[PDB]
């Protein structure tokens, strides 16, 4: 809000600000667009599916163990253990729930609106995607979902990279054990290094930091007698104090303009990243990708999505060869 931030509830400040014209109707038409864009990003990313699927009450997939990714009913939030670990790892400062003091004085004309999709329906979208990709393969991304047993789907996923089905149908047990070990170890791998969740952390940090300095500029002389508008009003006469008032108001206006300009570029970069994420989910998850290094490292088999505060986390299950032998060819 202009009038609150720039002017400390002073009639003279508001009257002088009115002379500058439309430097505020211009400074609100941008942030509203940014907010609408941010709201549209998540809806475009997660809500690829039309109907909400439900996992079967039983759980048995021929040796594959999905307990670490499927929702766990015990906890009230209906979030998977990996999702819970991700939520605990990220430290969030301000969420904007009637906060009215790390984040309490930002109500100096600045407000934080809440997201449209609460971080509970996102869990339902993720669960629907997981159920669809577990019990129906990739056929639910085109028409109606069609059921098919998991071993057959894995056999065709091998067939998709030039390996015949007999390999899977003869090494099912070893493959299942390897997948279980890997999915078990991923949690400890996440827990070990703190920098793994770097990028999301920065998204939480920078904006907050920016907000901080946007308040710190309020107490700046800017070349005036003092940073307190009422003090300069009372101590010095009206007829020439408008010079100091103009100095203060132009300084604060420039400070606000800089913040808006930075926000625009940051939003553009975030949009680019979100579009890349949407493409990655549309290709790797709802199908099998023949592109190299796009979906994991090595030959690609499957992907699994998970939600995180202001972000998404992909688990790529890939196929990599092992020890080799020489041979003579013709």
């Amino acid at each position: 809000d202009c009038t609150m931030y720039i002017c400390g509830d002073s009639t003279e400040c508001s009257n002088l600000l009115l002379q500058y014209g439309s430097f505020c109707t211009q400074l609100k038409r941008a942030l509203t667009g940014i907010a609408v864009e941010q709201d549209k990003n998540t809806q475009e990313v997660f809500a690829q599916v039309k109907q909400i699927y439900k996992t079967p009450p039983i759980k048995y997939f021929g040796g594959f163990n999905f307990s670490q990714i499927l929702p766990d009913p015990s906890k009230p939030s209906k979030r998977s253990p990996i999702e819970d670990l991700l939520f605990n790892k990220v430290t969030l400062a301000d969420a904007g729930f009637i906060k009215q003091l790390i984040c309490a004085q930002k109500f100096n004309g600045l407000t934080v609106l809440p997201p449209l999709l609460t971080d509970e329906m996102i869990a339902q979208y993720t669960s629907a995607l997981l159920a669809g990709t577990i019990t129906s393969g990739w056929t639910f991304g085109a028409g109606p979902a069609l059921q098919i047993p998991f071993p057959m789907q894995m056999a065709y996923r091998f067939n998709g990279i030039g390996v015949t089905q007999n390999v899977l149908y003869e090494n099912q047990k070893l493959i299942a054990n390897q997948f279980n070990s890997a999915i078990g170890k991923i949690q400890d791998s996440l827990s070990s290094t703190p920098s793994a969740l770097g990028k999301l952390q920065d998204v939480v940090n920078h904006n907050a930091q920016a907000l901080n300095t946007l308040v710190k500029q309020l107490s700046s002389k800017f070349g005036a007698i003092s940073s307190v508008l009422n003090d300069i009003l009372s101590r010095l006469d009206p007829p020439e104090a408008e010079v100091q008032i103009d100095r203060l108001i132009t300084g604060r206006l420039q400070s606000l303009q800089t913040y808006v300009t930075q926000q625009l570029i940051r939003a553009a970069e975030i949009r680019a990243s979100a579009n890349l994420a949407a493409t990655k989910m549309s290709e790797c998850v709802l199908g099998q990708s023949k592109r190299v290094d796009f979906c994991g490292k090595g030959y690609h088999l499957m992907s699994f999505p998970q939600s995180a505060p202001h972000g998404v986390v992909f688990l790529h299950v890939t196929y990599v060869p092992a020890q080799e032998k020489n041979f003579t060819t013709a």
Binding site: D1, M4, D9, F97, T111, P114, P115, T118, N212, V215
Partner: protein, 380 residues
Amino acid sequence: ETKCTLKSFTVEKGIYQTSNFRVQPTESIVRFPNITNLCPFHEVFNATRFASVYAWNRKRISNCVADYSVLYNFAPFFAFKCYGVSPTKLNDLCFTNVYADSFVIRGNEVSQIAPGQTGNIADYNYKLPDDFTGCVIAWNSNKLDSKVSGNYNYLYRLFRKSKLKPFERDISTEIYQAGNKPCNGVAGFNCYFPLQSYGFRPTYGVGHQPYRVVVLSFELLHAPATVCGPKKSTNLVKNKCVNFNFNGLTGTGVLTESNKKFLPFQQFGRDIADTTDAVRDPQTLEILDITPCSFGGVSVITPGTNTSNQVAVLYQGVNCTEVPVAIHADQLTPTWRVYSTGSNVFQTRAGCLIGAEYVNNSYECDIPIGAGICASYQTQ
């Protein structure tokens, strides 16, 4: 108002943010500290051993709380002509020094002590500087300063070489060397004494009644203030958006009791955002807390103006139990108050919604409000 905030006669389906509301203050508080160290003026005024006019009795006045509102009833004030400076407004001026003096004069010599004046009392006894900026107060003293035989307690000088400089005294018991003959103390012919008696009689009425008189000097210049006004305080209120002036700390907001602990010398605390949070001494001494009070934004939900005219109002970030369902005049920023503000109130994580009723059904989102809540124009 929505039509006004964007220049058009038509508005389409959607949600628009028109303006913001802020609770206005109701009361003002000026919490100055205690007022001790009063200034001595009754001590100067209350005495029965005043001096004579030729040798008047002086007084020095320094750092002291002066209140020129206690002498008015203590004396009759037959004459109350002070200097040209506003006699009524005397409690709003600060000076560095107050040098004063007092004496007694006659009925015909009331105004003789004025800048640029001449005469026996104004030339060889005491003259006043032209730029003198001091007040004069006189009052009759014939009731007390009068003896049936003779009140031979005061005198006056009449003979001196020249006219005295301002702010000077010429007390000396010499003998005037009248004429060319050198009278060396004989006090004979061609020789006189420059001092005469100033006794008082009961019969002396109009024209000879002694008037006890006091004047005090002002010196207003560029220097730190020493003698100032009372700086009266006011009372305190709690849980009410009010202004305050704690020791020259302008600000506004709701006020409550303060927690935490302050060092004895510290007065007002701060925070990471470089703002004031708690202050001291509203009355006597304690710790008290200031907080900005409720303000927020308003959003108008409406379908196309060519379809209907009903609207809904979303107040952002305000508690439905504390929202202005009253939206009274003066105290509330939004001028418009003809709205119902009743029988339809809903609490949402984004704010308070008035103008729509919750439904247990579930459809697609038409006009997104937020936090999973969406509004739409439907037929009952």
